[PDB]
From a paper:
S-formylglutathione hydrolase (SFGH, EC 3.1.2.12) is a member of the esterase family and is also known as esterase D. SFGH hydrolyzes S-formylglutathione into glutathione and formic acid and can be broadly considered an esterase, or more specifically, a thioesterase. This enzyme is involved in the glutathione-dependent formaldehyde detoxification pathway, which prevents the negative effects of formaldehyde by a series of enzymatic reactions involving formaldehyde dehydrogenase (FALDH, S-hydroxymethylglutathione dehydrogenase) and SFGH, which depend upon the spontaneous binding of glutathione to formaldehyde. Sequence alignment analyses have shown that SFGH has a conserved sequence motif (GHSMGG) that harbors catalytic serine; thus, this enzyme is also referred to as a serine hydrolase. In this study, we characterized a novel cold-active S-formylglutathione hydrolase (SfSFGH) homolog from a psychrophilic bacterium, Shewanella frigidimarina.
The crystal structure of SfSFGH was determined to a resolution of 2.32 Å using a molecular replacement method. SfSFGH was crystallized in space group P21 with two monomers in the asymmetric unit. The monomeric structure of SfSFGH includes 12 α-helices and 9 β-strands. The conserved catalytic triad residues of Ser148, Asp224, and His257 are located in this groove. The catalytic residue Ser148 is located in the short β6-α6 loop region and directly interacts with His257 located in the β9-α12 loop region. In addition, the oxyanion hole comprising the backbone amides Leu55 and Met149 can be observed at the neighboring active site. In the apo state of the SfSFGH structure, oxyanion holes are occupied by water molecules. The vicinity of the substrate-binding site is positively charged by the Lys65 and His147. Especially, the β5-α4 loop region (residues 83–112) in SfSFGH has a significantly different conformation with a relatively higher main chain B-factor value (27.9 Å2) than overall B-factor value (24.7 Å2). Our sequence alignment results also show that only cold-active enzymes have a conserved glycine residue in this β5-α4 loop region (Gly96 in SfSFGH and Gly96 in OLEI01171). Collectively, it is thought that the flexibility of the β5-α4 loop region and the open active site are related to the cold-activity of SfSFGH.
Author numbering:
A (entry chain B): 1 to 278
B (entry chain A): 3 to 278
Amino acid sequence: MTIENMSVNKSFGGWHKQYSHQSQTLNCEMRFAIYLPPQASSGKKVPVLYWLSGLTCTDENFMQKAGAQALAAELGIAIVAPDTSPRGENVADDEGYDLGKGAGFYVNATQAPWNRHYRMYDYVVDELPKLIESMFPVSDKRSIAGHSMGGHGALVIALRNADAYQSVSAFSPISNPINCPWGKKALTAYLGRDSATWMEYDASVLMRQATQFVPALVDQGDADNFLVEQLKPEVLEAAAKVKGYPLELNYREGYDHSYYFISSFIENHLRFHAEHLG
Amino acid sequence: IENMSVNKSFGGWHKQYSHQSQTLNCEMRFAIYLPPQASSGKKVPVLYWLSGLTCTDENFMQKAGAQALAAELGIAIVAPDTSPRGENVADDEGYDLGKGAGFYVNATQAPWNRHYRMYDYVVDELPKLIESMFPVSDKRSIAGHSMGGHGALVIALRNADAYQSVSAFSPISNPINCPWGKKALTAYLGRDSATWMEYDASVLMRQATQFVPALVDQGDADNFLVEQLKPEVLEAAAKVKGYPLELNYREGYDHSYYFISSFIENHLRFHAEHLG
C-alpha cells in the first residue's frame, strides 16, 4: 500500500495535506485530503470525521469551501475527505454528471464494467480508515458526515456499521435512492435492475429495520432545487418513526444545495460530532 | 444592474450582479455579501476586497470563510472582478497581464487604455453603484490579496479620507522592482518609471502625510515572497514617516486561501473597529 504527500498548506495552526496512494480495494490510484488540528502536533491522538462529498466533487471542494478547519482546530478533530470514485484511464465512466467518475454512490458495484474498480463502500469503511490510523495521530474514535450523494453514503455506512461510528450528520442527503432518478440510474448500473441488493444501500430502508442506533443530524435547505425530486428528506423523517431512531432533521428556510448552505451550519455539525466523539 | 445568482449565507445573502461599466466599457460581475443587519433596516458599512492574479469575484466568497464574522459584526463585503471581461476587451494569454491581471491601475497605453481603468472602477464607479443600490452607509474600508494587496494599500494611501482602514495578505509591496510589477506597469503605463511612483505601496507609504490604519499578514513559506512580494520594503517604508503599519510574518503559512482564511477573522475585527 504505497502512499505519497502531494501538498501541504498550514491552516489555523494545523495542516491541510493531500496524499495519493495505491488503493487495493479500488484497484487504482486515489487522492484524499486530511486536516490535522493543532492538538495533533501536541502529542494527543485526535478523533476523525470522514466527510463524503456529492456529485462532481473531489477532496478539494470540502477543504477549500466548507470553512470547517477553524472549528476542527478549536475542537481537536481530524477531517478526512476521500475522492468520490476510482480515477484512472482503466476506470469505467459515463459522460453523465450523475453516473461514473464523480458518482461512485458509495456502493460495492457487483455488475461489469463497474465491478472492476467501484468499491467506494469498502474503500470508505475498510481500506481508508486502516491507512489513516497506521499513518497519522488519529484515535480509534470516528464519525461520518456528507453532502447529497455523500449524505446518502454517510447515512448508509453509519446504519450498517453502528459500532464503528459515534455519530453521523448529512446535508441535503439522498434519503431514498431506490425511488428517485439519481438513485435508480446508479443502482441499476452498479447493482443490477430492481435487484434486492439495492435495499443494502438505502438510508430510509435501513433506518426502518435498524437495531443499534447512531445519533443522526440532518440539515436540508428549503430552497434546494433537488428537494422534491431527488432528496426526499420527509421519507427519512418517516423512517425514524418506525423504531424511534435518533434522527434530528432540520429544514433551513431560504438555504439552497450549495457550499454556502453547508458552510452556514458546519460549526453545529462539528459540535454535534465533538460531543459524541469526546 | 442584474442579479445573476443568490445564496443564503450565515442568515444573510451572497449575491452576483452583472452591470454595464461606463469606466471599463464592458459588462462586469461583482459579488456582495449582505449580512442579516442589512435586512433589519440598518445601513451597514462596506469592506471592498481586491483579489489576486487570475481570480474572479468567486475565490474570496467561496474560500476565505469571511461570511461568519461579516454576519456577526454586521459588515457588507464587495468583491469586484480583477479586470474587465468580455470579447470586446483586450487580452494577453499570459496569466500576469490582461484578463485577471488589472493591477488596479488606469492604463494609458494601447490596447489597454480602452478597458483597463480598475483604479477608477474600484475608487469611483463601483462604490457610487453600491451606495445607490444597497442599504449601506458611506463608511468603507479596503483589503486585498497579492495584486489585490498592492491595489488595497495604493488605493487607501491615495484616498486617505475615503477609507477608514486598509489590510492586505501577501501584497506586492514594491511593484516598480518586481517582475510582475515591471511587466504590467510597462505594458499598462509605458517604460518610464516616473508614472509608476503613484502605483507603488512602498513609494507612497514612504512619503505619506495622511495615515490610514494598516494591517498586513505575510506567510513566511510563500513561494512568491522573495521575488515578487518584497514585504521587507514595506517595513522599511513605514519607518520613514512612522506609518501605522502592523506587519506579521506567519510561520509556515503559504500564498493560498488556507493562509488567508486562517487570519481573515483578525482582519474583519481590525476593519470593524475602524468602521465603527
